[model samples]
Target: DLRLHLLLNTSVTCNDGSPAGYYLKESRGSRRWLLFLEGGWYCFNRENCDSRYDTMRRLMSSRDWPRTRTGTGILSSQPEENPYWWNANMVFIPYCSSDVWSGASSKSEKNEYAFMGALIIQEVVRELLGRGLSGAKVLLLAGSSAGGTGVLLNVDRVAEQLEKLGYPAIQVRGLADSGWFLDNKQYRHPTEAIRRGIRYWNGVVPERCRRQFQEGEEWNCFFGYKVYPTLRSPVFVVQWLFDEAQLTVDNVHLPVQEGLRLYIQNLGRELRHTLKDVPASFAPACLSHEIIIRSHWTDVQVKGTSLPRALHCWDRSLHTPLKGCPVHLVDSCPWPHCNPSCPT
Candidate 1:
């Protein structure tokens, strides 16, 4: 396994005037590269951002980033754990913008900090082009949580950016994990939060998806269900049936109570409904979030196929026939903790 080394690029700055960066592990002579954006949820407004700035400074600043980071889940170079993408060039991009990777706004006198989430990705790709991304066969833009949602937002843009940079031959695909969100009241304002965030961060949405929505409603592109159908590039989605983060909205507890049981069922049905047309997707019946990055990622399964297995199948299906291997998998079980492998 290759050691994940850090590269702090001064070209990009975090929200709090620190250099933005990513961790990398290169597999020699491999044209395939996987750049994964690490996820940290965003703070839409200044008050919340200030609170975030005080409580979780790491997400908003890069002043004291680690020299090295341990790779796990899909970022792992070990073939046993990550069968499909073990050897591809692995990059773990840190989240520091508090913008959910959609911001283009820079620092100013009026605004206290920068919100360059989208630019960070573009700069990262620009930085990679000189190294090895120029002649890449495939570029898998992937992320978990906010990062995954970022992938949904930025995948096609990256592809178009690469094309504009005269590397149109490079195939860019999206692998988003644990970023699919709903507008359920328990979860609350998946739409409105993004709307407010776009206003604050000067968010960048996919032009194709953005155009489909009317003026002042470009934020619709921020929604997974809304923008997914319009994505030009291939995207693979991974989401948990009962996401723990969604349950934490507004000091609400878990959906273990009888009253919230119906909400959980509704959540499950809506989630199931959204993924129906997204053939290259995976959803497990686990009460969790960000499975691809978790230690026990491979243990969880939907329709008897683990994420690794489904992901591999998805990869191969891009090139050739998947005779018996099915990629689109979701658990039919509506209730949480119904799956045998769910963690308590």
Candidate 2:
């Protein structure tokens, strides 16, 4: 029963529907590109197995994620196979269905539409890698909390699904965490209004067959009903300091760093305080969801390590698999107890 050892191995593939069984590892041919790690579905999926392979070996030896070994991140929870073989570097956790907005049907209507659980896994990874790919490189679309609320509310539906398949270059890069923006209205109309986020504690579908929590309104239809544009890619914002699975000290659900500091201060007060169309690349982490979910290493800024202790590849510098709170960089210090060449 349930036998696919090596942690649910299937060899992994994409050309149909991703995030349903992801385990990809490509970086030499086929013009490499595709990174999706959207884990913000309540501490990253699970079914039990030593807490899912020790939370996938603390996201593969933490931090610099071993330089993304060839790029490809997604582990929504199912992990087991070859499990990062000390370093084969190829992650993909596709099983989806705890209710991020309808899919694990049983009636699909609980939270009414769980913000389309990260745009239905980013439209099944853009129809399994945008029609067999022809050219171009880099096809990254990161994730953090709710996969960073689906990388900032699915960046306008991933730029309208790559301009309706015209294949607008097929390059999407975004990473977000503590990005739980839903524009809290306090059960405005949906009866239970999701009995208070995390789809009433079922998170991404589950709940014995369904009781509520549908497409969680895809994070208020991807933040901004009016204009708030700027998001084709090149976006990265990592905030922490007591993230507590975001809800910012509490106003009752909706705390991904206070919904990304209120979507970057209400879009910086509607551009009146422009930072130049912010495509996002913010930094500052050390708490909530535990140093970006069970840290092994993080402070973001990854590509090809360059000293700066490479943010201690997520631990070495002494972030040491954390335990009872100790991560700080926003000026609080206390990492590796400060000093291993400070200035993180």
Candidate 3:
């Protein structure tokens, strides 16, 4: 039997210093845990944060949130709907801190605010460990958009925490959905925005991560491409060749230029180059952003291979625990189908 449980009054809390909670659906037969992180863009400045007080405030505050559906993509309880991990326990961690679950301190302006996403994650996992996650055979960490970036940043920490809980033999993996932002500044949306976001959020970079960079290049730790090489855990990446978010939110004000087209192509190339060593990735030509939660999770395909199939194959191949893909390209798209006239 699949039942939804909205956990409240947990030790975990969000950025507004509000109590943090998660929506959990336990499976009847599986000991696996799939923790999904919700996605919402961050507020980099106090003005944007103040404006976010009304809408985004719920994510950080302790409140009786309306019951949400846990029947999408990998979280689906139906065996027919989501064949893989259908029986696994599912937990959805809502985005409240607006810091991509990376912030560590409270900010004060017109009022006090908490950016303690890192703490929220740690505490939430600790709670789950005590409940039943300590016995989990597999723990798959997945997130979308902003949450996707969170998985990339916090996957290692989650693994570390699990190991500390005597689950060193537990299989922990991650899937980042539409969070692989290019480190290049040539695009309309440069990496500086992320660096600024981290600085403003008071996000703490892992000390081990800081050691990966030179003294002057410490800021690169915030960028996923730079951080990828340092992660010991396996993470699959799912992104669109023409990401609607990057096109709309990141480059909206910029003039439509021919160079921008070239820039996107270069961005795709760079993305592939950086994640070449990742366990697996599914970069389709879809123009929209955020798969997995959407119907595209099963519908979208590259070279006639669906995302679910790709992930399944990748998972099966991980018999060695965390084996990554070799240099042999797996149905990679040669050219992007960037349509300026296409509806996002």
Top-scoring candidate (TM-score): 1
**lDDT for each residue of candidate 1 in 1-344, tens digit (9 for 90 to 100):** 33333334664678887778777788776889999898988988888999999989999887777667878888888888787787889888899998989998878787788899999999888888887889899999999998988999999999989999999889999998888887667533355777898899988888888788867787777669888998989999988878877667523465167666677788888888999989898887778878787666788777678788898898788884477688988888878878887765
List ranges where model 1 is wrong by over 4 Å.
1-11, 187-190, 250-252, 255-258
TM-score per candidate, chains pooled: 0.93, 0.27, 0.85
Span of ten consecutive residues with least summed lDDT in model 2 = 1-10
Model 1 residue 52 distance off true place after TM-score fit, in angstroms: 1.3
In candidate 1, position 309 carries an lDDT of 86
Kindly list the per-residue Cα lDDT of model 2 for residues 231-318, writing each as its tens digit.
4445544444224443342332432465555543442233222222332323232333522333233223222221122222222322
TM-score of 3: 0.85
Tell me how far candidate 2 lies from the true structure as C-alpha RMSD in angstroms: 18.7
- Candidates 1 and 2: which is better by lDDT? 1
| Model 1: lDDT of residue 11 | 48
**lDDT, residue 285, model 3:** 55
RMSD of 1: 2.2
lDDT of 2 at 49: 20
* Per-candidate RMSD, Å: 2.2, 18.7, 4.0
Candidate 2 Cα lDDT to native: 0.35
